[model samples]
Target: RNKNMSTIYQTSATASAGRNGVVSTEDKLLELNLSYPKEMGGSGTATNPEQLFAVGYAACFSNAILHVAREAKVALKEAPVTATVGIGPNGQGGFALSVALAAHIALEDEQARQLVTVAHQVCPYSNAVRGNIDVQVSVNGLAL
Candidate 1:
């Protein structure tokens, strides 16, 4: 949908081993150990992929909400987002992931709802997962 846009910045990261090693950025700025969660039959000592994805998606979506608010001339003191990512078997034989985002904003109920909806439209993570997984958004506990 954004084929005409030019790339502004790009970064790379590498991961070694399957949920049992480490992940590091190309710049060496980020290096973290990985471990499979107990829910998946492994020790839940270190971080897991779903946790990482949830954090990244939540942060990105919150930023997207702020961006939309700025463009709409709305003042939002804070917009905190919490994303929950779930993985399960896909009836067709592989695994599938689902996500739900809960965002809280200091604004009118209607405005908060609208901003989050628009944010989903612009968020890269949301766009990437559209139609591929079930993603639900809720503003102050109210589903959007």
Candidate 2:
């Protein structure tokens, strides 16, 4: 468990119709139609919850790298993170989720991996999912 503190940020979004629904933020800045993937037994034409999570995770992770890089005095030009979210049966009559975060950094392989590794520690999504799901973090195609 983590110690409670004053909120640094807060946001809210609402969803309806289960897997095939509409999700909209309170401000409507993010509003979209969600469709269950064909692989999961529904029309896969629209975005799904997994894809939404992927987008947020990837964006948050790259932002986290910025905080770590600045304190380390490293200039980060461009860092794009690809987040993959997977789901499957846990075999316990429940479901399990997994995630993969791949970061593309301009630095050398070793250095890039090091920075991404640090970012994993700082990203809120990484922190929230830690111990609750399986997450793989890689940099320059090298898993850490």
lDDT against the true structure, each candidate: 0.90, 0.86
Question: Each candidate's TM vs. the true structure?
Answer: 0.94, 0.91
lDDT of 2 at 73: 91
lDDT of 2 by residue, 1-144 (tens): 354377887889888687798989998998899998999898898998888889989999989988788978999987899999998899999987899888888888888878888888877888888899769888888889
lDDT of 1 at 101: 96
Cα RMSD to native, each candidate? 1.3, 1.5
Off by over 4 Å in 2: none
Give the range of the ten consecutive residues with the poorest summed lDDT in model 1. 1-10
Among these predictions, the greatest lDDT belongs to 1
Q: How do the residues 101-142 of candidate 1 rate in per-residue lDDT, one tens digit apiece?
A: 999998889989988999999999988888887698999989
In candidate 1, the residue pairs with backbone N, CA or C atoms under 3 Å apart (3 or more residues apart, or in different chains) clash, namely: none
Report backbone clashes per prediction.
0, 0
- The candidate that achieves the highest TM-score relative to the unseen native structure: 1
